[PDB]
């Protein structure tokens, strides 16, 4: 993707994450855990459903048209055949480009949602953590399950840990 | 502590085409081209299966077409080994003649 | 005997395109030459 998260600085996806598209994995004093992020998951799904809504269940009614299978007649039949062949090639083109374009965009929007979640998390942690470059943050303070949970649900107060974190980050 | 951000993956991915790549694997895809029919013109329709009957044969009555001499149909199904004739011959303007019959409604 | 009609038989019309027959009647998907066209409905799959 153009943002460089999915198939980028995030080395691979998690097959064990089956309750959401994006999420958090942590390791702390109490153990190792995994939890999906619902808002970013839903944001991606809503955009894809928006595309589907434009394409699925919206066909157009045609009734009496021209004949499209035929005795040799020459001129007029040449014209009827050419008209239909022209029309099919133009629709076949539209269909091909539509899928190639939407797919490029779908892959880019899903990569974007991953990047947004990462950026949002980074800003939350302020000076209390460092980006390890693989989608992981090293958090420079004791962070139990409730602390990790507060980060995931956007209630993390960085000021609470800042002194502990700064001392750990900036030493020898 | 460590907090890692990530996304899901599946073991059974699907290959799709994009603007920049002929073959890229995504977690899921849906088919946009309908490629099959159930072989019937729709329940709620009045249909006749000529079967062994050739269609043109309905007009002139070989033994085959005995059932279908005066058939009434919304949907008419021709079949492959069907013979329009009992005594060898062919219709002049044959393909043109059938197209008349198919859209007739019956005769 | 148990909306879109083609000479091959009726076809579902949930899909926008169809490869069955250029001859159609009713609310039908549009005839195209491709036999398949996959629309991604998920992110890039990156296993390991």
């Amino acid at each position: 993707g153009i943002f460089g998260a999915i198939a980028g600085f995030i080395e691979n996806g998690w097959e064990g994450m089956v309750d959401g598209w994006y999420g958090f994995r942590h390791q702390n004093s109490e153990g190792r855990g995994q939890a999906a992020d619902l808002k970013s998951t839903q944001a991606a799904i809503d955009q894809i459903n928006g595309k589907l809504n434009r394409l699925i269940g919206k066909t157009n009614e045609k009734f009496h048209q021209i004949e499209k299978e035929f005795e040799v007649e020459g001129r007029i039949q040449d014209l009827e055949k050419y008209v239909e062949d022209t029309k099919i090639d133009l629709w076949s083109y539209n269909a091909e480009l539509l899928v190639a374009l939407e797919n490029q965009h779908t892959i880019d929007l899903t990569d974007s949602e991953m990047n947004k979640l990462f950026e949002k998390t980074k800003k939350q942690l302020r000076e209390n953590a460092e980006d390890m470059g693989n989608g992981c943050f090293k958090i420079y303070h004791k962070c139990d399950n409730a602390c990790i949970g507060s980060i995931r649900n956007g209630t993390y107060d960085h000021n609470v840990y800042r002194d502990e974190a700064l001392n750990n980050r900036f030493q020898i | 502590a460590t907090l890692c951000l990530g996304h899901h993956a599946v073991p059974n991915g699907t290959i799709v085409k994009t603007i920049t790549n002929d073959r890229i694997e995504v977690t899921n895809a849906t088919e946009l081209v309908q490629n099959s029919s159930i072989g019937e013109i729709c329940k709620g329709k009045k249909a006749v299966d000529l079967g062994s009957c050739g269609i043109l044969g309905t007009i002139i009555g070989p033994p085959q077409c005995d059932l279908h001499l005066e058939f009434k149909a919304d949907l008419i199904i021709e079949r492959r080994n069907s013979s329009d004739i009992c005594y060898p011959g062919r219709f002049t303007n044959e393909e043109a003649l059938r197209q008349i019959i198919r859209e007739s409604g019956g005769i | 005997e148990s909306e879109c009609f083609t000479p091959n038989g009726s076809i579902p019309n949930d899909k926008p395109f169809q490869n069955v027959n250029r001859i159609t009647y009713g609310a039908c998907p549009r005839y195209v030459k491709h036999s398949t066209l996959k629309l991604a409905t998920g992110m890039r799959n990156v296993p390991e």
Partner: antibody, heavy 131, light 107 residues
Framework: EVQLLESGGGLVQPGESLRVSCAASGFTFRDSALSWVRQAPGKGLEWVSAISGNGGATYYADTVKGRFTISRDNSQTTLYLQMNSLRADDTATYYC????????????????????????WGKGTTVTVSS | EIVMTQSPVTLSVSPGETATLSCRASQSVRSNLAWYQQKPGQAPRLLIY???TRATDIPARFSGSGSGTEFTLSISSLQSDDFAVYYCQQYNHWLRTFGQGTKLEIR
């Protein structure tokens, strides 16, 4: 059997709060969406809100955009609706309604498919707001 | 934020005749549209969803149609128990809206 039962409601003074429960019983595994719809006798139907998965909705009508809040308790299989700052026009028969979507949508089973139609309606609880 | 207007407010139709209802909707709407039959003293019951796809195990006399703005609901063979009120909803604006309601009469 996919019936749900609405409990609560009653008479309340304008400005007070009141939450209505919806015991989701039956076929509903409660990975599907649920909604609330109110109707006052003498008026038509009006969609109120919706819930999805966990905290994916967040979907409220403009009439109650700043007053009503929708809760979901999957452990006890009950849908809630905290109606705060009730006004006079909030008097209605609040219906708890199932939500179904075409199978092409709803990619992840839990999250919200932004196209729902209500199939199984509830018995309804009448809430009267006066002095 | 997307108003629905049904027409008329009430209609009188003899039992047996077809009763066509209207559900005019401001702004385009096609994917999602549901019809309901709320009999007095009862909760609404789903009849058709999407536009034409009727609900499970409902009579075939309930027909649905429409596109974008104008939507119709026709009851083929009318029965004396169809004296209910009918409504129509829409997608989406993340905010579904209902219709005003159409009262159906049966002398």
């Amino acid at each position: 059997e996919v019936q749900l039962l609405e409990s609560g409601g009653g008479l309340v003074q304008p400005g007070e709060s009141l939450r209505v429960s919806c015991a989701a019983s039956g076929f509903t595994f409660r990975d599907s969406a649920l909604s609330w719809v109110r109707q006052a006798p003498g008026k038509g139907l009006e969609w109120v809100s919706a819930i999805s998965g966990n905290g994916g909705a967040t979907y409220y009508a403009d009439t109650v955009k700043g007053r009503f809040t929708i809760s979901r308790d999957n452990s006890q299989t009950t849908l809630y609706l905290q109606m705060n700052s009730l006004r006079a026009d909030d008097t209605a028969t609040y219906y708890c309604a199932k939500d179904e979507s075409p199978p092409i949508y709803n990619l992840m089973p839990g999250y919200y498919s932004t196209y729902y139609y209500m199939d199984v309606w509830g018995k309804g609880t009448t809430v009267t707001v006066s002095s | 934020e997307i108003v629905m207007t049904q027409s008329p407010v009430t209609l009188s139709v003899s039992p047996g005749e077809t009763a066509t209802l209207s559900c005019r909707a401001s702004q385009s709407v096609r994917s999602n549209l549901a019809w309901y039959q709320q009999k007095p003293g009862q909760a609404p019951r789903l009849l058709i969803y999407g536009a034409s796809t009727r609900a499970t195990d409902i009579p075939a006399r309930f027909s649905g149609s429409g596109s974008g703005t104008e939507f119709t609901l026709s009851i083929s063979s009318l029965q004396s128990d169809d004296f209910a009120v009918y409504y129509c909803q829409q997608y989406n604006h993340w905010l579904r809206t209902f219709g005003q309601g159409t009262k159906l009469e049966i002398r």
